[PDB]
A paper describes a structure:
Encapsulins are a class of BMCs characterised by their conserved subunit (Enc), which self-assembles to encapsulate enzymatically active cargoes and can remain porous to cargo substrates. The overall structure of Enc subunits across species with different T numbers is conserved and consists of a peripheral domain (P-domain), an axial domain (A-domain), and an extension loop (E-loop). T = 1 encapsulins of Mycobacterium tuberculosis, the causative agent of tuberculosis, and the closely related Mycobacterium marinum, are known to encapsulate the DyP as a core cargo with iron storage ferritin protein (BfrB)28 and FolB as possible secondary cargoes. In vitro cryo-electron microscopy (EM) single-particle analysis of the Mycobacterium tuberculosis encapsulin was used to obtain three structures of the encapsulin shell in intermediate states, as well as a 2.3 Å structure of the fully assembled shell.
Author numbering:
A (entry chain W), B (entry chain F), C (entry chain QA): 1 to 265
Write the structure that this text describes.
């Protein structure tokens, strides 16, 4: 067995298939970051750091010796525990199709939110700079009126053009901004369609982020490094409940500072 | 023979084909519910209940014995009798093509209305909770002005987005609401087209329901269980008329409470 | 895995084989009901109810609609927990052949007693009518003197003959009555042999029932429906003991009211 200790969990095979399906579905729906960044293959469990290729000056060991430390970025392992009713698990073999997988959905939504907020806003404790912090283009303010959203977005499209950047540009919106441009309409279309006319990429719902992000998806600018992708593991169990977790280990690198514009309220 | 006792009816083969065609056509046109919910294969005549996979605590038979009743949902058999003129039946072999099949059409419309109102509004006596009652998302009020319909509908699309739900969303409208958004026009399109721009699913005419319903059609959320699909059976006959019926047996299950928004006036 | 969670139990393979053998043996010995009634194949875990094929009038949904609920019988799941010493379990791999399986035997005897008392005396909370309650033939009183038992039994054989019933008749006795007709002797035979001469079926020891039952085993009159047969499942464990359970889910149907005579003291 492995670190998931999956065979020790009192979960049947059919219940496991339903839990895997629910977690994978809810996660994909709430991920916006993997649609725009380069996603590496999983390095594996032993992978601990990503080389940046830079060098750090250290106090010379002896006379005439020049020493340099190799710089690297550590992976962070992110774990979201959740708790399942054993009655709901037992219902699945009897043929129930409405078993309560709400904790699985909440854990997948929380893991997806962490991953997206780590990619776009950073996680300083894990030495990850967000796309918002690593952007060299000027930051823009989103207006109160949703009918004035496409104007400011177009100004962001000016900045990537002034930065000398090609590629399909894509706009990612926070859930508040996505709702505002979805529910306001002008001439038989919502403002989301007006945003769709400005770019050759995609208007992407990004419920974890704040503000908005416009960026190129030409490739090679944004890199998500995975040691291991999302997995479900077993912690402990009692007569009534099974404690499990969702787990993934990653770091994020931004190679190109001028490939994005961040917007705030 | 079977319970339809079809060979006992004084109905010719050509008349039977015309009656089957008329009933099937009028039924499909008036069904909205089967277009959005999962529809099972017919279980058969012996099928009486659907297992939910839950357990009900009962008074212990003896000391040290723990007993539980299996929970289930009963099927309901729905029968709509109708009456045909025997002269109209006899006209069909002579080559008439305008035989009065209005009672067949009224029976098919009434059966379709019952089935749709059972799926969406429930039938408490049959222990069926409607989609409106089983929805956990907040209920919305439809405005008087049809030009303000797409706004509220978009708010419903916000709620499924706040519920963490994917899939093609579909909007079902009552006949009053469908007529209101069909006959009012803005900038060369009716408001029904404005509703069509908001979703990747379908604006569906639902003449049996009240208000409106917005919901996902990703699958696995709404389940209609059929023991036997719609069939035409023979009751009795006299010199002038044949009494027949339309009959179907079903139950409805909603597994996912947050997959729908109900709207009312 | 399944709902038994059998691989989570700290029970070795040899100990499992001994426990299965002990439980199966003690159960068969104490079952009288399955020898006389029709026993269905196991429906499976999803099976929750048995259709009776009857209809229940419900308040009409709308005008001109006739509604009927399908009638059914719910299954009941019967669970008997028991507790095993872990030292006795560990003794089995070392080659012990006298490991204390008394709790397994007591659980199997209690499960068998419940099943037989449910078949013959009913379980009202599970909507099961016993054979004694569902019998339309008159009830008889068993005499105090065991030498007068065969007389009354013969009167019961008159009643099934007056009911117009064929087939091998079988007599089931309570443990008190079986002991009384076993230990009293007349002319070199116990009274049990005198009972054996009256029928072409079998004198059956039935320690769970009260009184006596005479009935035909021609088939199709008494039906035991099993969702799942007897299984051993794992609940929880500590350093000293393993808590397990015996479990079976069933209902009982009597189709033929005149196929039996019940006797009481």
């Amino acid at each position: 067995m492995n670190n998931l200790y999956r065979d020790l969990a009192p979960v049947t095979e059919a219940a496991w298939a339903e839990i895997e399906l629910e977690a994978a579905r809810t996660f994909k729906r709430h991920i916006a970051g993997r649609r725009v960044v380069d996603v590496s293959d999983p390095g594996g469990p032993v992978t601990a750091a990503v080389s940046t290729g830079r060098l750090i000056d250290v106090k010379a060991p002896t006379n005439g010796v020049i020493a340099h430390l190799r710089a690297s970025k550590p992976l962070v392992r992110l774990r979201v525990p959740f708790t399942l009713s054993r009655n709901e698990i037992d219902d699945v073999e009897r043929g129930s199709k409405d078993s309560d997988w709400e904790p699985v959905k909440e854990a997948a939504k929380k893991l997806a939110f962490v991953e997206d907020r780590t990619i776009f806003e950073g996680y300083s404790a894990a030495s990850i700079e967000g796309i918002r912090s690593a952007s060299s283009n000027p930051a823009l303010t989103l207006p109160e009126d949703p009918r004035e959203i496409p104007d400011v977005i177009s100004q962001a499209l000016s900045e990537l053009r002034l930065a000398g950047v090609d590629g399909p540009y894509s706009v990612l919106l926070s859930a508040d901004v996505y709702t505002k441009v979805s529910e306001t309409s002008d001439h038989g279309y919502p403002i989301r369609e007006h945003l769709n006319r400005l770019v050759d990429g995609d208007i992407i719902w990004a419920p974890a982020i704040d503000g908005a992000f416009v960026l190129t998806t030409r490739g090679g600018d944004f890199d998500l490094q995975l040691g291991t992708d999302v997995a479900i593991g077993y912690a402990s169990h009692d007569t009534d409940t099974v404690r499990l977790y969702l787990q993934e280990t990653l770091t994020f690198l931004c190679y190109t500072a001028e490939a994005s514009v961040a917007l705030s309220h």
